Amino acid sequence: RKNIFTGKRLNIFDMSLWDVEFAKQLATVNEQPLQNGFEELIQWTKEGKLWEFPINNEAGFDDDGSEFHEHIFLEKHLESFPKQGPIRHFMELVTCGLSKNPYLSVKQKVEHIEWFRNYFNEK
Amino acid sequence: LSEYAFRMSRLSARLFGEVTRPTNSKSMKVVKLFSELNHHTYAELMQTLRFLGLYR
Amino acid sequence: DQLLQAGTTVSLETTNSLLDLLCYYGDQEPSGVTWRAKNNAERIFSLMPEKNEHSY
Amino acid sequence: EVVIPKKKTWDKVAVLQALASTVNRDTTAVPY
Amino acid sequence: LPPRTEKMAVDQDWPSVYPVAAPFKPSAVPLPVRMGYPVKKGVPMAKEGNLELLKIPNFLHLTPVAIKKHCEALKDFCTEWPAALDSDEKCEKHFPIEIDSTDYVSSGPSVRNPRARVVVLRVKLSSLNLDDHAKKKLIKLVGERYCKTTDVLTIKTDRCPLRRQNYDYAVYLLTVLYHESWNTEEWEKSK
Amino acid sequence: ADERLRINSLRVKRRWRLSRIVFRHLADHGQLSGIQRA
Amino acid sequence: LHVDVPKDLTKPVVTISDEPDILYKRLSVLVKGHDKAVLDSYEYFAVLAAKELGISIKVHEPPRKIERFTLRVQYEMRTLYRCLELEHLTGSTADVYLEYIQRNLPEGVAMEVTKTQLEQLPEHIKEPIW
């Protein structure tokens, strides 16, 4: 007349690929077919096939964690160029043009500046 | 044009990042330049599906 | 076997991974297999120099 | 006094889970 | 085989039949709906096999009962507007700056839109602590961005690629404009 | 693209990407979204 | 389901964070379509959802646009509009409402959501630098 969780016990205690496959076959015990459309949408969202809502038009894009000062102030890369000549004028204009380019990353702008540096160095 | 308007305008240009030196307009073009930025393969897919017995 | 022939010393963790794979699949490629004496896993286990808890 | 409410954050699929729990199984249809 | 509309009761739970946006299924929709320009001494085409009914973006998955039963469950995700802000008069008092940003929903594989980076800051100059000289300088400096009728300064930033960067740029532009308006040069003496 | 631009700086229904005949064929069938002939 | 019903359901986890919520003065949802009936049905759906979620909504119809082009054979494209201004809604309510109505966006209809967040002046601008 007593519940099965009371009685004699052992009393002996007191308080790689193997793991990967173990977890994979744990995944199976709760592997049932989709039961309706909402579950299908949830499954695809978890898989990442579906867009996130509300739509963020810049989702998955962070521009390498760049800051605005790295895009708008690009004149620090013109230090190795002439400081008061006509090349200074042309490069100031070029960096003004690059700083107003929203389609380019900072890396592309700096490599443009470096190409100009190299071309003038050869000449 | 009062020279006061002139230097106040070129200060505005420095603050907002426009070209401070007015370089006329013909040489202003490169600012615009730098401000901006396969039916073949699909057919051998169709051929491959044919070979595998899944097209036509 | 190629690395052994080349005389290159294989690290302990790597050979442990080898024995993991061989034991879990029992010398067969991924799709019961009965344990065969003198199969590859036993040869790897015998060939390794210092045997730790993980290999056993 | 402007008491700005605290932001509520929810999981990626919370809205879909709510909408799914909102509808029950169809008795006259085969599985989806 | 027979359609399953024959097995549907007249008091069924319709939302469960169409949980989500699904196309018109004549074997699942229990309506004798017809559509099509009739022929002479003819009738509009029946639903079974009608491509025109299959072309409609049907709202069967969104019925008033379904909408209510959905938005009743979605209430748990909402917060309450601060009751102190009863009208726009107090909104323009306690929160002077207005930041306008846009998102675009098209259909396709790419979620990107070039127009989502634009940010528009709007602030009334009367909310900023500027003296006579400061306000004169700021107005002359901004130019057309200031509208005299509304007393509003509108700074639109789109230079940076992202939207947070443009918002930061707009904030920095406002910061400089204020500080450089509150400054008098040796040049500024002889107006 | 970048290389050619740098030196330069110092100095039919293409709208839909269809053949002009084909665009008529598609649009007559109603295939194009919103292209109603008037 | 007359007898067999789920006994309990997993309500999604919505945790009340400590960070203060965003406040939106206005939220203009401009929906564009080739069909006026779809836009009317979507207007009914969105308005009903807005009334039930407590959001204040006002609807109007911006003017229709026409793109006419000749290849003689002449073709035309219609763009009809419906603009839904929500007012005085917080960040979470706006986010959930937008998720709902954008997931339920009908075929061939695009959306342009303009959000006007309310913010305070930066502390740097409260007084001039000395």
Swiss-Prot record, chain A:
Residue stretches in coiled coil: none
Source species: Homo sapiens (Human)
Domain of life (superkingdom): Eukaryota
Subcellular location field: Mitochondrion
Protein name: Small ribosomal subunit protein mS31
Signal peptide bounds: none
Assembly information from the UniProt record: Component of the mitochondrial small ribosomal subunit (mt-SSU). Mature mammalian 55S mitochondrial ribosomes consist of a small (28S) and a large (39S) subunit. The 28S small subunit contains a 12S ribosomal RNA (12S mt-rRNA) and 30 different proteins. The 39S large subunit contains a 16S rRNA (16S mt-rRNA), a copy of mitochondrial valine transfer RNA (mt-tRNA(Val)), which plays an integral structural role, and 52 different proteins.
Family: Belongs to the mitochondrion-specific ribosomal protein mS31 family.
Full protein: residues contained: 247 to 383 of 395
From Swiss-Prot, chain B:
Biological classification of the source: Eukaryota, Metazoa, Chordata, Craniata, Vertebrata
Descriptive protein name: Small ribosomal subunit protein mS33
Source organism: Homo sapiens
GO cellular component, one term: mitochondrial inner membrane
Family from the record: Belongs to the mitochondrion-specific ribosomal protein mS33 family.
Protein location: Mitochondrion
Residues of the full protein shown: 4 to 72 of 106
Coiled coil: none
Keywords: Acetylation, Mitochondrion, Ribonucleoprotein, Ribosomal protein
One of the record's GO molecular function terms: structural constituent of ribosome
Self-association and partners: Component of the mitochondrial small ribosomal subunit (mt-SSU). Mature mammalian 55S mitochondrial ribosomes consist of a small (28S) and a large (39S) subunit. The 28S small subunit contains a 12S ribosomal RNA (12S mt-rRNA) and 30 different proteins. The 39S large subunit contains a 16S rRNA (16S mt-rRNA), a copy of mitochondrial valine transfer RNA (mt-tRNA(Val)), which plays an integral structural role, and 52 different proteins.
GO biological process: mitochondrial translation; translation
Swiss-Prot record, chain E:
Keywords: Coiled coil, Mitochondrion, Ribonucleoprotein, Ribosomal protein, Transit peptide
Top-rank taxon: Eukaryota
GO biological process: mitochondrial translation
Compartment(s) where it occurs, according to its Swiss-Prot or TrEMBL record: Mitochondrion
A GO term from the CC aspect: cytosol
Any one Gene Ontology molecular-function term assigned to this protein's record: RNA binding
Family: Belongs to the mitochondrion-specific ribosomal protein mS35 family.
Subunit structure: Component of the mitochondrial small ribosomal subunit (mt-SSU). Mature mammalian 55S mitochondrial ribosomes consist of a small (28S) and a large (39S) subunit. The 28S small subunit contains a 12S ribosomal RNA (12S mt-rRNA) and 30 different proteins. The 39S large subunit contains a 16S rRNA (16S mt-rRNA), a copy of mitochondrial valine transfer RNA (mt-tRNA(Val)), which plays an integral structural role, and 52 different proteins.
Protein name per its UniProtKB record: Small ribosomal subunit protein mS35
UniProtKB/Swiss-Prot annotation, chain F:
Superkingdom to which the source organism belongs: Eukaryota
Subcellular location(s) per record: Mitochondrion
Disease linked to the protein: Combined oxidative phosphorylation deficiency 38: An autosomal recessive disorder due to mitochondrial dysfunction and characterized by perinatal hypertrophic cardiomyopathy, growth retardation, muscle hypotonia, elevated lactate, dysmorphy and intellectual disability.
Homology family: Belongs to the universal ribosomal protein uS14 family.
Summary of subunit composition and partner proteins: Component of the mitochondrial small ribosomal subunit (mt-SSU). Mature mammalian 55S mitochondrial ribosomes consist of a small (28S) and a large (39S) subunit. The 28S small subunit contains a 12S ribosomal RNA (12S mt-rRNA) and 30 different proteins. The 39S large subunit contains a 16S rRNA (16S mt-rRNA), a copy of mitochondrial valine transfer RNA (mt-tRNA(Val)), which plays an integral structural role, and 52 different proteins. Interacts with LIAT1.
Record-given protein name: Small ribosomal subunit protein uS14m
Taxonomic source organism: Homo sapiens
Part of the full-length chain shown: 48 to 126 of 128
